[PDB]
């Protein structure tokens, strides 16, 4: 039973990280709320500069705390920016080719070949180009060059794979990320 290999993409070793920064009205951008110039793909400069601008992510702005107890003078309502993203510290990216049909040599099966150790495994996966949560195919990158840092160009994403719940200062990096290793090791 050898798979009939279809086209291939790359699923990286994904770890989620989130940041959030609070900016008062006297910061320069907060005047009467979040300016409509900020959208999901836009970025902010008061975050950590260590962030790779090329990387995938998701950004947002919101109204936050206002008062003398939240670091903003004159009790001016503030603007809080936030962002969540994923990264690959170990670079363990797996090349995935779905199994459209089986030939002797179950349904919706796929091959997920390991790149470094050349380990082979079998597990069902989504069609190339859809981010169904809970299965294989959450993060799909066209090339191995794309998935080694998860640049925003050739990778798809469902933002809800990472969670966030703001506080006065920071957020929560809630993770719904499902590792392909835990699915392919018991099924190896």
């Amino acid at each position, epitope marked *: 039973l050898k798979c009939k290999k279809s086209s291939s993409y790359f699923v990286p070793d994904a770890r989620s990280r989130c940041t959030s920064v609070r900016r008062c009205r006297w910061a320069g951008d907060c005047q009467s*709320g*979040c300016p409509p110039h*900020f*959208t*999901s793909n836009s970025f902010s400069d008061d975050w950590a500069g260590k962030m790779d601008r090329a990387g995938l992510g*998701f*950004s*947002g*702005c*919101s*109204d936050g*705390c206002g008062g003398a107890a939240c670091g903003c003078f004159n009790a001016a309502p503030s603007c809080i920016f936030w962002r969540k993203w994923v990264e690959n510290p170990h670079g363990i990216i797996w090349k995935v080719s779905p199994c459209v049909a089986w030939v002797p040599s179950l349904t919706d099966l796929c091959e997920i070949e390991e790149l470094k150790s050349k380990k082979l495994a079998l597990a069902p996966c989504n069609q190339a180009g859809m981010g169904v949560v809970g299965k294989v195919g959450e993060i799909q990158c066209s090339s191995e060059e794309s998935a080694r840092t998860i640049k925003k160009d050739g990778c798809i994403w*469902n*933002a*809800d794979l990472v*969670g*966030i*719940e703001l*506080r*006065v200062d920071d957020a*929560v990096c*809630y993770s*719904k990320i499902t590792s392909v290793e835990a699915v392919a090791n018991y099924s190896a």
Partner: antibody
Amino acid sequence: QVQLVQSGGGVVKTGRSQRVSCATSGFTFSSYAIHWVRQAPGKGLEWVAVISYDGSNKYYADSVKGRFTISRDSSKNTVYLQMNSLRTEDTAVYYCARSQASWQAFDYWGQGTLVTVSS
Amino acid sequence: DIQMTQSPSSLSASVGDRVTITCRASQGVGTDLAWYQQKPGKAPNRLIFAASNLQSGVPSRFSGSGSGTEFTLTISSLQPEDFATYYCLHHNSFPLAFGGGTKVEIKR
């Protein structure tokens, strides 16, 4: 104080439809998701529906599965709820709530309205 | 489907008394739980989220704990303004579900 408004309450006979609107201001409307909650008079709360930030993800309650509809207008910043094939046991008070992802809790509510059904 | 119960269906205490309320689950839901309050004639508010964390803007006297199928909210110091119906919510998976709620009233 993130604030919302709503409209569309009143009385309606059986077998018809009705619509309620929830308009928001004070946050990035593209990076959030919207929820509905109903409260029967003299009883507990109940979960209604949920819409995500792009329309890709929608989920409906089991009891009213296949009969309700939730949508959002990313331009005017208002969420519309449409109820079809009404009955006389849907009477409650309705509220509109917000969340970041489709699966976290709620953070802020609105003021709610009354929707009444009888013959 | 899955169910969620509360205990007990009605409590009562005077000023300063410590009160415990429990929400019991037919299955372990991890830490995905929250607690909600409605004072009479208002929209609800949120107090405790992620089963251990307190919402900002809430007085710290409210607290909750638990895991799996054992969840308990405890109010160390009780005041008449706290008197509302408290509901437990879970968000482990769709469909979500509220609780039957627990009513707190004055003893006299």
